[model samples]
Target: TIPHLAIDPFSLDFFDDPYPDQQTLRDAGPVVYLDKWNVYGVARYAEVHAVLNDPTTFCSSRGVGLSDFKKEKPWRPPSLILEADPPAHTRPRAVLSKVLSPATMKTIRDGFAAAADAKVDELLQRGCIDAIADLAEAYPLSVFPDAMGLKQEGREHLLPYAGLVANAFGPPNELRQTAIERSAPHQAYVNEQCQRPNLAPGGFGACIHAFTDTGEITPDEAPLLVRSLLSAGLQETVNGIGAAVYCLARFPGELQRLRSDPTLARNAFEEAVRFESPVQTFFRTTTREVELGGAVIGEGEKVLMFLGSANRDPRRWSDPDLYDITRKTSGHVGFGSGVHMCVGQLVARLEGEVMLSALARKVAAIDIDGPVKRRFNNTLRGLESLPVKLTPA
Candidate 1:
């Protein structure tokens, strides 16, 4: 039998710092039903990985949120790729997979690396910079919009809209309310950009239209798919990259190691993801009766899998909370595991490696001048502003 567990999943304190509670839950058992949310939570690495990989048993069709999609209206239609299961999920994924493969990404790699180097040089001349807005947000927003073939008329609206969509994924609260209020005008602008006349030729948006033309998916479904790529591709990567930079800056020794050997860029990014997960938590619904760690999980219940918690689970990781670039961080759920794992992870990695390497090559040291501010979204853990001083080599 599972040990008695009675933590309120929605309490304010839980969100403020969840590590303590995560440890308690993990020690209690693998799956503990939180009464407040009426959902089973898989806090340990083992059970969380199991549930994420077995999509058939823990389906995403009910939506990966607190509300059950079958019983309520989703914030928008589920992402055709992220929300889909196999067979239904196969074709569109295949199309995107082919287009975004490492080989295809390689074609654009040099250009992106050059852009990152240019940005770092400019920032280093200034000596101090807000890393989040200047470096993290600027890089992807600059590169991805052009890659997606969005026109310049009002492309500035994309980042804000993407922020709103991510904020809406959380429970109905002040954050969600603010996002809804802020996103109204930009929503119409994004909808307008989805039209054929508004998109530039030979971009991802245009390719999506081609899929519609070939009857792979209906024309009506095209815009939402493009929107999904836009929404999913932007904020998390920026947030993750920014956080990784902050980690290195605060720990100068690690930054020097990376600067001395640029190949450590990939491992450094993974370490950041493992240390402080960007995409923190996503929900799944149990399909039938299941037993995990001596707990009886009933059918049709929501299960909240804390990726951030699992990343630091003491039961699974030694010195679990420490950030070490040299550790073996493979199999981490930072990009997630299982069928619903992030398909665009390769793109995120390419951008990160390029940016980090660029910064490392030009700077002798990077350090924080003030306290880093946190941007609170229910689902994503990110920085709002990170003030830093860069000393040139």
Candidate 2:
């Protein structure tokens, strides 16, 4: 018989601190059924990896959250990229691949580094600031929009809009309920901002819209793709950058290591993604009858892959709990693997590299000024507030 447990993974309690229960889920077995949500959970590294790579079996068309599209209507039109499988998934993925290609990154790299440098200068002058608010949130809100070619007005809607998107990925819990009600205006602003006329001439949004002329994506489909980019651009990387900063402050030796060799900034951010795992868990549907981890799952069954737990699985890494920037972290599923892997990862990595490079060069220490606050989300993990004081080098 498959191991069964009653756990509310979507609850704020679990979001506040998920490791102990995540470990419990992992220890129970590879495929444990959560009675509360009526879904199977795969917490081991191997199983999680297998499920992601075998996306045809564990599909995304039914929605990647607890809500299955076959039964329930989505709150909004499902994401063309994040919510679709192949054939249909292929076209948009290709456009995104071209839009966010390595060549595109080279165009913006120098400007991104300069912005990070300037932000570091500002933070150094302030001496103390909330890393979440002043740095992590501030950096992306400025640079990413400019990259997307969005106008400056009404940019404030982005964070809340992204917050709502992340929260909606869970079971309709209280947090999801609150977010749905609170995000209406933010959603409207995002909808309008993503339109072609609203986008700048050379921005990423304009670039995505350019694909319409080639019939790669339709005129109707272009705005939705831009919408996808907005969600991808904000909360995911903001939390990632925040997690990297938080890891350095808590694990001071790692910071020293970064200071010693500034080249490790990318590794520092990557290891932090594995250590903290901002994109925590995703639900996948079994396309047909499949036996995973010895349990017989029926057609259209829901399987929740615990990415956070898989990142920390001892079977996958030595000293799994230790926050070591120098650790080899090539295969972590912090960004899900296979076809649906994060298309925006290159941009995220560049942001992390520049910001950390600036911090390592200019800041002697990242001291926690007060209690660290956790931002609760069903599918995302990050600090709500991180009061930190930076000692200028």
Candidate 3:
């Protein structure tokens, strides 16, 4: 029988420490019913992956959250890409193929790589640092905004705005309340920055807008496209970076592995993402009745797919809990899976690989020296404060 669990995964307590409940959810059955939210959930790796892969059955359009946007008013506009399905998703999807292409990443790689050195070098001077605030958050915020040609003056608002948007995916909760309060002022700032004139010529944001020139997309879509790039680049990147630092601190041997072979920097970043899956869960509504794990779910039912739990599922990986840089993490859903998979993933890896490589070359060991505080949100899983004592190489 499909397990019926009452755990409110959206509650702050679960958000703070999700692994225990995540394991329990997965163990309950391939598909479980959450009595608290009145939603069906897929927690096992294979089941979750199957749902993500078959977007036709598990459509993202109605809404990808506990609340159905079709039935209720969304707090904000739905994402053109993240919240879209198939043919409708194709339009915005076409625009990003070139924006984050390997060639484009190559163009910005050196600059980002250089910035990573400066950022890490400055933090290392302090001896002790808050890994989340000082390193993880600092690195992406320093380079990405400028690369996208954003105004330097109000750039601080970017992260907050991104944070609030990500938080809104869950049911209305205190975390969402806090994020809304913190991110309200920046919404206009983020909106205005999406304009073509506000973006520098040839930058990623500008290039996205330029698609209007060739009729690939209408002028109305330019800013929204820029918004997708910004949210994708800014939000998850922060969580992923914090996840990396947290993973390294917890596993010194992985840090040593990266140091010994700096090329393993990409591997380190990917492994960290797998071990500490940042975005965790995303919702997909059924297009029609579907049988999963021997149980049939009704049409329009919400399936909260747990990506983090799947990443660590013992069925798919050996020593799944260990943070090993050498493991082939290609199949991990840290950036998600299938067509709606994160568009900014390569761009994020570009950021992660360079920054991690720079840190590996400069620092010896990352030790947890103070109490770690977690950031609670509806979706993102990351540290808010991680104090670390860095030993120089």
Candidate 4:
């Protein structure tokens, strides 16, 4: 039976700080319906994970937002891969999966690591820097674009477009409107870059075209698929890097521990993803009438799963809110779950490990110099700036 105590997940206050409201919902029930949005929510860890992994019952095609793609204009066409179901989503996913396999990623690891180390050294030389824009933003935007074989043109446009896409997931509001306006100027360039002729050889975009030529996916669908990967890939990598830095700054002991053993870089990055999920929430729509954790869900209803909240759900984790690098975090929904789970997660992970390890190698000590400011986006949880003082080893 669904709990009667439900709250709007999009209320301004909730957007500013979601933890309290998330806790309330989780304690109330595993699944609760928000009358305001006419959407169901799974705030607890177990329930949220179940919803994400069970795509057959909860379709992603309706689009993962308040508006169902079947009934309304999607901000863009549904992601050729991300928004697709089996059969339609399968071929593209398989093509890209093979292209981005572990061995392929390993080939670029050393270059990424070297680039990260050099960037950190530059920042350390500066003595003080805004970690978010200076380090976090710089590293991936530099490395990943090259790896993808993208010839960068106004790369700064990527972040704001990603921000808009995320905000569009929410109700139309001043913020959402603002994001739309900001992204307008960049849409053309982004679309153009997705073309096969524009993509440099040896990049992800080129590989995607190869898939299309081989009939893995229709040629018309290839660009949009590559665009989706680019948009999803860029911001999340910056956020993950930022979150790891934020964690280390807050927990000096853990920073020292990481310095002693650089291998902790992998654990530290994963822990940060668990502690401060970059992509906080994504929606799913019910295919048919379903009952989850005693809650009755009607068919065609949208269900919002709070990945950040689930990562810290007390019902499923001990000291769930703590940023513990030693904790077992494999089950986390940070990269999501099920078939729609982030297919490019290995790419994101490799980016984080390389950047964090690079920083750990160069800096002997890192500490926050001022209060950090959080960047607002309906879906992404990221910092606008984290001013820090770095002491080089």
Per-candidate TM-scores read: 0.94, 0.98, 0.96, 0.96
Question: How high is the lDDT of residue 160 in model 2?
Answer: 83
1 versus 4: better TM-score goes to: 4
- Per residue, candidate 3 scores C-alpha lDDT tens digits across 1-393 of 888999988898888778889889988888999998889998889999999999899999988877787788767778888888988888778788777778888889999999999988898889899988898888898889877888778887777777788787887677766776776677788789889899988788888887887756788888888887766557677777888888888888878888889999998888888887888889999989999999899998999999999999998989998888899998998778899887777888888999889878999999999999987778888888999998888
Rank candidates, lDDT, best first.
Answer: 2, 3, 4, 1
- For model 2, give the 10-residue run with minimal summed lDDT: 230-239
Candidate 1, pairs of clashing residues: none
Instruction: Give the residue spans of candidate 1 off by over 4 A.
Output: 1-12, 213-216
Task: Evaluate model 1: give its TM-score.
Answer: 0.94
Which lDDT tens digits does candidate 2 get at residues 1-393? 888899888887888789999989999998999999999999999999999999899999999989999989988898989999997899998998899999999999999999999999999999989999999999987699999998888888888888898888889888888888897798888889779999999889999999988867898999999999987657878888999998899899989989989999999989988998889999999999998988899998889999999999998989888899999999999989999998998999999899999999999999999888988888899888999999998
What is the alpha-carbon lDDT of model 2 when measured against the actual structure? Answer: 0.91
Give the range of the ten consecutive residues with the poorest summed lDDT in model 4: 1-10
Candidate 4 accuracy as lDDT: 0.83
Q: Which has the greatest lDDT?
A: 2
Per-residue error at 282 for model 1, in Å? 0.5
Q: RMSD in angstroms, all models?
A: 2.0, 0.9, 1.4, 1.4
Among the numbered candidates, top TM-score falls to 2
The lDDT for every candidate, in the order shown, is 0.80, 0.91, 0.85, 0.83
